[PDB]
Amino acid sequence: GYDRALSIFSPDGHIFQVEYALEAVKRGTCAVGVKGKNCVVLGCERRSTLKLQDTRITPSKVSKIDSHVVLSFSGLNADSRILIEKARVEAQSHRLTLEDPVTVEYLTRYVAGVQQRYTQSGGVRPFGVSTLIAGFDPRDDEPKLYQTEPSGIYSSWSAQTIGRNSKTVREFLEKNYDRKEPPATVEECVKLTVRSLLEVVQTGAKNIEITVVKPDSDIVALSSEEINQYVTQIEQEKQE
Amino acid sequence: PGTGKTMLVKAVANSTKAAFIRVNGSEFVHKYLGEGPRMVRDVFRLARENAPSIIFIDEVDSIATKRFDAQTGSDREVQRILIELLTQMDGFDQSTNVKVIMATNRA
Amino acid sequence: AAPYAAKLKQTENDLKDIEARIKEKAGVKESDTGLAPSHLWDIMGDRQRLGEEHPLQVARCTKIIKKYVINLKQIAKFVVGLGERVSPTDIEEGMRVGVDRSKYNIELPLPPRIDPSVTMMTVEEKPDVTYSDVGGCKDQIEKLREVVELPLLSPERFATLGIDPPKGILLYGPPGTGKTLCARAVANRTDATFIRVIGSELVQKYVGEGARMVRELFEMARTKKACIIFFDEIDAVGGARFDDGAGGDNEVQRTMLELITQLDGFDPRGNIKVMFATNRPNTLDPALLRPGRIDRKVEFSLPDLEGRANIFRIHSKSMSVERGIRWELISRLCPNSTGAELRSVCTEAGMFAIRARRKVATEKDFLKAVDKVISGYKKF
Amino acid sequence: TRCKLKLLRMERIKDHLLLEEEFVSNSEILKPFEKKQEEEKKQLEEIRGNPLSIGTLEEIIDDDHAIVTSPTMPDYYVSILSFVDKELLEPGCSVLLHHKTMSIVGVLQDDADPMVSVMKMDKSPTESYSDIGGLESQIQEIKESVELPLTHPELYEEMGIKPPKGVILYGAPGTGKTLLAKAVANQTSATFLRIVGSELIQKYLGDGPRLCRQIFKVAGENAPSIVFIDEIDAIGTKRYDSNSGGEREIQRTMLELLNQLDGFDDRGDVKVIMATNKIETLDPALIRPGRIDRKILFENPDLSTKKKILGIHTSKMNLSEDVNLETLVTTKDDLSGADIQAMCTEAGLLALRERRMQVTAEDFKQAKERVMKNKVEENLEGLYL
Amino acid sequence: PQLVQMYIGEGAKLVRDAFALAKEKAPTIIFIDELDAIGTKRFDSEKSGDREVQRTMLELLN
Amino acid sequence: LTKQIKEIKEVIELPVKHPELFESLGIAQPKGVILYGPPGTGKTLLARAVAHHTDCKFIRVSGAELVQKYIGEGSRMVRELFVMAREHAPSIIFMDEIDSIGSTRVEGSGGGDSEVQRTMLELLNQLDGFETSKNIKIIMATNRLDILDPALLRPGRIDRKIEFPPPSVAARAEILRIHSRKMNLTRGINLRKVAEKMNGCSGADVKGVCTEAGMYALRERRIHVTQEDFELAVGKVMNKNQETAISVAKLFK
Amino acid sequence: GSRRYDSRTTIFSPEGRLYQVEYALESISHAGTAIGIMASDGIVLAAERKVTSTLLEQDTSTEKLYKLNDKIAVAVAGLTADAEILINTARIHAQNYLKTYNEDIPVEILVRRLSDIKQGYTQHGGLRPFGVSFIYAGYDDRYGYQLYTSNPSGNYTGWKAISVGANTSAAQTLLQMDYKDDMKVDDAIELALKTLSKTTDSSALTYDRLEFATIRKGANDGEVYQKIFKPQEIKDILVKTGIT
Amino acid sequence: DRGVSTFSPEGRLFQVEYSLEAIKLGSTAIGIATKEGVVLGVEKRATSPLLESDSIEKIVEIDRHIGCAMSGLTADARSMIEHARTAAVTHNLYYDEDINVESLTQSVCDLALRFGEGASGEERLMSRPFGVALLIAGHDADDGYQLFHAEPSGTFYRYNAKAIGSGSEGAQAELLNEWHSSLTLKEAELLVLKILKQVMEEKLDENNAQLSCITKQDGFKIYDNEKTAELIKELKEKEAAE
Ligand SMILES: Nc1ncnc2c1ncn2[C@@H]1O[C@H](COP(=O)(O)OP(=O)(O)OP(=O)(O)O)[C@@H](O)[C@H]1O
Ligand SMILES: Nc1ncnc2c1ncn2[C@@H]1O[C@H](COP(=O)(O)OP(=O)(O)OP(=O)(O)O)[C@@H](O)[C@H]1O
Ligand SMILES: Nc1ncnc2c1ncn2[C@@H]1O[C@H](COP(=O)(O)OP(=O)(O)OP(=O)(O)O)[C@@H](O)[C@H]1O
Ligand SMILES: Nc1ncnc2c1ncn2[C@@H]1O[C@H](COP(=O)(O)OP(=O)(O)O)[C@@H](O)[C@H]1O
Ligand SMILES: [Mg+2]
Ligand SMILES: [Mg+2]
Ligand SMILES: [Mg+2]
Ligand SMILES: [Mg+2]
């Protein structure tokens, strides 16, 4: 149909290539962000069911853009490699010219700008990745959560999920989290993200990856034994 | 053609003293858009009646193709002739009629 | 376990024998229609049965030669004569005749052709629909009034302008536009007869039998005064040629041709309006579309926002609705689409309310029905 | 189990009792032959020499003559003599004519054709409701359109809404679509007509359109009804090509049914069940809602659905209580309900090769490997890139 | 093809009469119209009575 | 291969002979069966062989529906095919449609073959009785699973699938042995050698070896074979199979 | 669905899964088998040759194996034509990096950059994806011996052992079954030869049908020594493993 | 194609027709101009309570004396917004003069009044056809408060009140007569809320609607969610009396 054109504006008002991007986000891993008062917890699936895989050199889904800016993603791994690279360069650009450390909010916009640009320029596909960019603003200790979409726009939610079986996760996020009050403690906040991920992973120590990002360049990924500890405690409740 | 394939069978036709059934690919391909499957069955039956018989099919280069198009209605009969020929040949072993003889440009 | 297996085995035999026993029940009792006093009729009937004047073999005059040359339907020709006394002036080319089995003489002239009777079953008289409850405020609704009503009500103005009276309108629109609905409404209001012809039904063919029916029906119309002949679905048969195909066909060219020539050139008409229902003009042979057959064509235009609030209201009246319900808001959210799509939305809103166990449909119900229909059409 | 036994006991004393009653009751000595019967009888033999060559009544002229066409190309201007009222006869009726001299000796026909009998398949639905392991949510969409006006007319009447016309079943085979069709049929106990759409594809001249008309007549006569036009798409969007004589037929049949589905107005008392694989990637020929109303897409079975289906099957098996049910369904991706049905059948077959009469604890974990591998090959889903 | 009434049996013959009539009572200009239904340039050209109308067309001109 | 014989035995013979035993001991009844594997294995033969001993009426039913003209078109009388087979229990309908034909229509959904076939498949459960007992097995045969008519590909009612490999050297020894016994026995009993040394590719291949070895005795005007003849016969048959099949390729990779 | 759209990279399939990428898989698999086994004491690269003619000199062609630099070697499977652009760029890029930092290229870097051109051709430019898969065998001191694979799509995944091109599944079922976790370098050669003889038409696995190299950390004084074995040393070791 | 090289048989251009639909489906935005300020209201169309509504904004300060709300396509709108900001800033640098609203409407529309890939005595930077309208409100000294309806289609039209988006046909019908020039800034705010209340199915609160004004005095001033909320309360109150 109109899938062969981008320039052609379409009376449907909807260019099919754009629709098809969404199909692509769905297929990918589930990646979730839930934020406290002092933390972003990012719980994400990393598949590891692959036989004869040396896990050490296989890239973790989470990639440090900046020293305090992180990215998780759902959608095609190849296409996603371009966003990570543009975004890294721009990170260091920011410091080189403003001196100021990376404004996260600029960065959210910069990234979306690329998925937008390519919607207008024929002969350049719109990317079929949606991302989570999360960070902490210069001179600030309030957590910051953003999602980008392949529609070439951006938005902030109090907590959000993307990728396979996101429908299932969204019910959890409505009932156990609230915009009004995020779980004040870091600890509360991490335990709920583990329970959400369990709904679609259905038991895995390394299939669940938790990276907690705190203010002031504090990045630490939870220990496999500690992750295992969240699971067992939760699993006792399930039969009660 | 010019390698006298047909010519060989003209030779054998005299000497057999016995039936010779000389048919062409034209007969098999559609004549009512449905005639073709029936037409396969009749040559094999007719051979049994007047056995010994030499079954000779001159053209089959166009009846036998790897692929087909079922969107044309007329083509569907081409497809069906090919498949029934494979089936009948297995039920035609251990007969007085010689097992199907055919002539082609290529193998 | 095992002694209760054999309880199943017994059960099955029984059920089968009862079903055969139905035939025995029906019995041998024979009785036929003709109650109260039409079995006393049968007593008269007996002597007249033995009597002879029935049947008469039916044939058809093909030429009167001052005796008559009759042609029977088995196809066999005879020269015959008058029976008791059959006036010359009664027997005409095409007139049926009653002739005796084997003494072959005319008794009664019989009205021409048996084919009108067959086709008069299809014909339906002046359907009635009220123009006010006709949904939309469509422009189309108005141009129908010009074609049909105004030449019948006041033929004077048309003469004075020295235009030809409009007589042909071609209706086409997506399905659910209301082509059938508006034609029935203007049949009623103008107070003119109506002839239902359905062209999809034509199948009686002997190379040009379909052409006989069509000439007779159109001619029936001329005889009639203030009438409409509505040929329905002429998308195929008297619509598209099937010549295009490999082996092809032309029984449809016979039917098509006949209609074109009745329309084209001199030929009297008794205020015959020609209505043509095609789903698409594309399917319609271009021969018909281009002018000198049907005078006017209107492309149906899907109802305006004012017309879409208007159809919804018609439905909402039939419904039990909430007070202060925003008809206009529901309509705006809804696509610009047929009166049909809108009929469906009111149907599903009703049902979700019933399921939810409510007798009065909320605004909220119609927000749900809308979401349902958009998705449907799209996905396909 | 037990519930079924309780019923057997009653059913076998009902039949017995009836059968015995029947002798007397039908007659065997009762032999009505009193004045009213005797009249009918005497007359009927006299008037009717046989065989009797049927006609079709084309028109009446009021003078107790009619014009009929016999099967012979010559038609016959006949007397009406005896029996059937003049009023009762309306044009288009099929009629009995007497062979010596053609006269209207009655009617007993009503345009009886064998085609109507063939179609007529009210006969015992194999499904009762909720024998099926399907989900409450899918069946309670079909039920809402079809059942709910017949059982509770109060709500529809009060709202004032019209009763819906038709549904479309489409899936996904192995969602038990035709099972669903005969679940619905049982509950309504409506005259359940069935016709398959390929009988309306023929080279024979004009026969398709004739068949289409029959269907509307049949349903109306035997109303309330459900008309299963099964593989509606055979006539419609689905093909049989036009370089096979199809440049005549297929057009005429498609149009004809289309025209009668809208009609002068929707009947609103003939329910339809329209089967088709899906009309998502096929062309749509089922012409907009309001004549087909609610359209039903059956979900591909998720993990909770197949639990319910699975419970039926495990009942007969012995040594599947130790086997953990939950883990067999989870491990497999979400797939057809047909694939769980396939698995049960393979499972038993496989136990026999091991030599165990019914499944072993081991046999069930093994069963899953053979069925999953076969089915994933048959139907391959896009690989994540 | 319009003067073909019902069957192409009784009508193929009707047409042979129509040709005969039309030539006779000259001078005349016979206006024969649309030729498309009897044209049939195809190989599936009918050998039925449709051939007869068509042939008598060649005869008139010759 | 007898691998194969046990696998097919379970599936057809037991539910036909006694549905009542099968049903109870297992659960459900098996459906249609699809035989896949290369041409020239002798899949057809298997289908004939089961029908022989069971006493199923092997009705060979041509893929065509226009070869049937007797009571009308066999497309329109789909229903007559069902009704009559049911009466004619036990039966094997060998519905030969290889599905190599219609390369376009695999991925399509159009075509006359697709139309007729899908209604046919639906008819078996709407009329009923083949559901109750599968005394009439609808044996399909095809080269692969991936070339099927689109109606049969998707779920429906096909379930059992039997895979046939081209022979192994063990299986090859068996086929070769028994034809040689009937004919003239290989002297020095090096029919075992011939199978050990090489694999053919089909049991069709193997019957070709049988014919040729025997033709070599005919040229001498002898009526008995020896090992010397099989060693010539094998090299000729088998090598010819390779030179006709390789020519299609140019020089890619 | 019906109308398969794929003219350009930018134009999406309805499915959303670009058909040009799909066709790329077919192509990779067209070529014969190549196999990389990473061992704790070397990497072993062993493959059956594409070529098969004896007229054509199989011996001098190590079509599969080219070295890009002193530590890094790649095994190639797919489209020969397309492939030739990428092998050449990769060598120059490696030497560009050595210019800049005067250190050998890290294995991980070298793959990620090449993968990114492969994406580049779908992201922009009608230009077909260059449908080729390499198995990279490299060493760096960041992670030791490293093995990678690259998808035509333009993404990479590490592996303990992998197979590419034809009959990937069969070779894969065998490798995992008899896998020895530690893996000795001697062992890897034996294990590789066993897998190739079963997937290779000649079951005697002739030398002239074999390409072989071993990269060894088990080379004196703890260092990385790449050695391309010629057809004459393949033959000597064939008789050592006993398949012949 | 159906580009702009193709001239419609109609006398139109196909892309131009295609642009209108995107505005029709767009967000509902209302502006009513007085001679005491212009008040613009929008629906922020809140959809979930996990969505942060405050963050999201469809009323954006473009320049000191000008703000814009957007209706059409969300994608196009990025580019459109960046164009506008730039256009204003260039003139301020270049002549250091406050611009008219009129001058701004034109300049934004300058990129708009060309479509295609072909250019013949001009540059191209476009690669499509854009389909996004704005309400461009402001103040200039010369003609006071002005409201424009900037179109991606024909020449810009000045308006005294305008409503666009999906609530448009109703909203606009109400406006023709409810508009007057005698309104106060306080009368006018409540009138904007009133129309908004009717055409939005869900009930009116400050978490899904936001009000803003341009009065020269306070510049482009975004209303406090407290300031918005009270007037909603006031709205319900007068309707009870009424
Ligand atoms: N003006 C209207 N008001 C209300 N509903 C309407 C209107 N017009 C048509 N419909 C609805 O659309 C459906 C069909 O209307 P109608 O029978 O006149 O169709 P049509 O366009 O003539 O179609 P076909 O192509 O099937 O011949 C009905 O559900 C009817 O209520
Ligand atoms: N195992 C066998 N024993 C005896 N003869 C055999 C054997 N296998 C094949 N043949 C011979 O090969 C002939 C042809 O094989 P057949 O047509 O039965 O093959 P199939 O594998 O079922 O193929 P298709 O692809 O045609 O359906 C048989 O008629 C028979 O003479
Ligand atoms: N909603 C459903 N209703 C009924 N059975 C279902 C449902 N979903 C899944 N099934 C399962 O699928 C099994 C087989 O369905 P079956 O294959 O007869 O169905 P169909 O969709 O009518 O297709 P076809 O005629 O093409 O085989 C059922 O016995 C049942 O286990
Ligand atoms: N043995 C031969 N002696 C003479 N000419 C021959 C010989 N064999 C074949 N030809 C020539 O080959 C040509 C084709 O012979 P024909 O039987 O018609 O068959 P085809 O073209 O099908 O092979 C003739 O022109 C004939 O002269
Ligand atoms: Mg020749
Ligand atoms: Mg209509
Ligand atoms: Mg079914
Ligand atoms: Mg076979």
Domains of chain A, first to last:
1-240 (3.60.20.10)
Measured in Å, residue B8 CA sits from the centre of ligand 4 at: 9
Q: Which of A21, A57, A85 sits opposite G158 (nearest CB)?
A: A57
Domains contained in chain H, CATH given: 1-242 (3.60.20.10)
Distance CA A214, CA A193 (A): 16
Contact yes or no for A56/A100 (Cβ under 8 A): no
Pairing of strands B55-57, B21-23: parallel
Residue F245 phi, psi dihedral angles, 5° rounding: -80, -10
Q: What is the C-alpha radius of gyration for chain A, rounded to an integer number of angstroms?
A: 18
Q: What's at E60, amino acid-wise?
A: L
Which residue(s) pair with H211 in the sheet? Answer: H41
Distance CA C236, CA C252 (A): 8
Distance CA D198, CA F126 (A): 15
Do A155 and H15 make contact, defined as CB atoms within 8 angstroms? no
- The first and second tokens of residue F82, run together, are 């069902």
Q: Which of G108, G125, G151 sits opposite A57 (nearest CB)?
A: G108
* DSSP for H132-187, written as a single string: EEEEEEEEETTTEEEEEEE-SSSS-EEESEEEESTTHHHHHHHHHHH--SS--HHH
Check if D55 has its Cβ closer than 6 Å to any atom of ligand 3.
no
Interacting residues of C47 by C-beta distance below 8 A, sequence separation 6+: none
Distance CA B28, CA B16 (A): 26
Q: Which ligand is nearest to the CA of D300?
A: 3
Number of domains in chain G: 1
State which residues form the domain around G175: 1-244
DSSP assignment letter at G209: G
Question: Distance, in angstroms, between A216 CA and closest chain H CA?
Answer: 23
A11 interfacial to chain G (CB closer than 8 Å): no
Distance CA C131, CA C149 (A): 13
Residue G228 phi, psi dihedral angles, 5° rounding: -80, 125
Distance CA A54, CA C351 (A): 57
Cite the DSSP H helix spans in G47-102: 80-101
Q: What's at A226, amino acid-wise?
A: E
CB atoms within 10 A of CB H231: 16
Q: Inter-axis angle of helices D136-151 and C339-356, to 10 degrees?
A: 100
Of D323, G146, F244, the C-alpha closest to D331 is: D323
Do A202 and D384 make contact, defined as CB atoms within 8 angstroms? no
Distance CA D143, CA F135 (A): 35
Given a contact as 3+ CB pairs under 8 Å, which chains touch B?
D, F
Distance CA F115, CA D276 (A): 12
Contact yes or no for B95/B51 (Cβ under 8 A): yes
Of H199, H232, H218, the C-alpha closest to H64 is: H218
User: Omega before D224 cis (within 30°)?
Assistant: yes
Do B69 and F110 make contact, defined as CB atoms within 8 angstroms? no
Residues in chain D: 385
Chain A CB contacts of H50 under 8 Å are 157-160, 173-174, 177, 179
Distance CA C228, CA F172 (A): 83
Residue to substitute in B7, B9, B10 for testing ligand 4 pocket (most ligand atoms within 8 angstroms of CB)? B7
Distance CA B100, CA H228 (A): 94
Query: Do chains B and G touch by CB distance (3+ pairs < 8 Å)?
Result: no
Cα–chain-centroid distance for residue E4? 9
Distance CA H210, CA G72 (A): 62
What percent of the residues of chain G are helix, what percent strand, and what percent coil, each to the nearest 5? 35, 25, 40
3 state SS of A20: helix
Which of B71, B88, B90 has the highest number of chain F CBs within 10 A, making it the mutation to test binding with F?
B71
- The first and second tokens of residue D171, run together, are 């899936």
Shortest-distance atom of ligand 2 to CA F143: 25
3 state SS of F37: coil
| Cα dihedral sign, F52-F54-F58-F63 | negative
Pairing of strands F91-96, A154-155: unpaired
Distance CA C54, CA C183 (A): 46
Chain A CB contacts of G146 under 8 Å are 57
Query: Do chains E and B touch by CB distance (3+ pairs < 8 Å)?
Result: no
Check if F123 has its Cβ closer than 6 Å to any atom of ligand 3.
no
Distance CA H88, CA H66 (A): 10
Distance CA C212, CA C204 (A): 10
Breaks (C-N over 2.5 A) in chain C follow: 66
Return the HEC string of F180-221: HHHCCCCCCCCHHHHHHHCCCCCHHHHHHHHHHHHHHHHHHC
Q: What is the C-alpha radius of gyration for chain D, rounded to an integer number of angstroms?
A: 28
Element (H, E) at B37: helix B36-49
Distance CA B96, CA B53 (A): 8
Q: For tokens 């030729």, what's the residue? A: E35
3 state SS of D61: strand
Biggest alpha carbon–alpha carbon distance for chain H: 64
3 state SS of C99: strand
Contact yes or no for F40/F205 (Cβ under 8 A): yes
Contact yes or no for A134/A70 (Cβ under 8 A): yes
Distance CA D122, CA D194 (A): 8
Q: Which long-range contacts (CB under 8 A, 24 or more apart) does D292-295 make?
A: D292/D165, D292/D166, D292/D167, D292/D168, D292/D261, D293/C344, D293/C347, D293/C348, D293/D145, D293/D164, D293/D165, D293/D166, D293/D167, D294/C348, D294/C351, D294/D141, D294/D144, D294/D145, D294/D164, D294/D167, D295/C376, D295/D167, D295/D168, D295/D170
Q: Which of B35, B41, B70 sits opposite F102 (nearest CB)?
A: B70
Q: What's at F74, amino acid-wise?
A: G
Check if B3 has its Cβ closer than 6 Å to any atom of ligand 4.
yes
Distance CA A210, CA A197 (A): 10
Contact yes or no for C91/C61 (Cβ under 8 A): yes
Sheet-wide strand order for B21-23: B21-23, B55-57, B101-102
Distance CA D369, CA D96 (A): 67
* DSSP for B60-82, written as a single string: -TTT--S---SSSSSTHHHHHHH
| Cα dihedral sign, B56-B62-B65-B70 | negative
Do C329 and H199 make contact, defined as CB atoms within 8 angstroms? yes
Dihedral, CA atoms, B5, B10, B16, B17, nearest 10 degrees?
A: 160
Contact yes or no for D269/D149 (Cβ under 8 A): no
CATH of the domain at G96: 3.60.20.10
Pairing of strands C227-232, H219-222: unpaired
CB atoms within 10 A of CB F54: 17
Of A203, A204, A189, the C-alpha closest to A238 is: A203
Distance CA D338, CA C137 (A): 52
Which of C304, C308, C325, C329 has the highest number of chain H CBs within 10 A, making it the mutation to test binding with H?
C329
Contact yes or no for G37/G186 (Cβ under 8 A): no
3 state SS of D103: strand
Q: Inter-axis angle of helices C251-263 and C209-223, to 10 degrees?
A: 20
Chain A CB contacts of G153 under 8 Å are 76-78
Contact yes or no for D173/F156 (Cβ under 8 A): yes
Of G9, A2, A125, the C-alpha closest to H3 is: A2
Which residue(s) pair with C99 in the sheet? Answer: C57, C106
Distance CA B85, CA F63 (A): 12
Contact yes or no for G144/G106 (Cβ under 8 A): no
Element (H, E) at F7: helix F4-17
DSSP assignment letter at C164: P
Q: Inter-axis angle of helices D136-151 and D177-188, to 10 degrees?
A: 30
Burial D162-183 (b: 16+ CB within 10 A, else e): bbbbbbbbbbbbbbbbbbbbbb
Question: What residue of D is the nearest CA neighbor of F127?
Answer: D121
- In A87-232, the DSSP E strands lie at 129-136, 143-148, 154-155, 159-162, 208-214, 218-221
| Measured CA distances, F118 to F111, F123, F124, G45 (Å) | 11, 9, 11, 51
Do G151 and D385 make contact, defined as CB atoms within 8 angstroms? yes
CB atoms within 10 A of CB A116: 24
CB atoms within 10 A of CB H3: 18
Q: For tokens 């001498």, what's the residue? A: F220
Contact yes or no for C99/C105 (Cβ under 8 A): yes
Q: Inter-axis angle of helices A186-201 and A224-239, to 10 degrees?
A: 70
User: Omega before D51 cis (within 30°)?
Assistant: yes
Cite the DSSP H helix spans in F88-111: 103-107
Pairing of strands A63-64, A40-45: unpaired
Of F25, F29, F35, F3, the C-alpha closest to F16 is: F29
Question: Distance, in angstroms, between F243 CA and closest chain G CA?
Answer: 14
Burial class (CB in 10 A: 0-12, 13-18, 19+), B7: exposed
Q: How was this structure determined?
A: cryo-EM
- In A61-174, the DSSP E strands lie at 63-64, 70-75, 129-136, 143-148, 154-155, 159-162
Q: For tokens 């949606």, what's the residue? A: A130
| Measured CA distances, D356 to A179, A229, D313, D348 (Å) | 59, 43, 18, 9
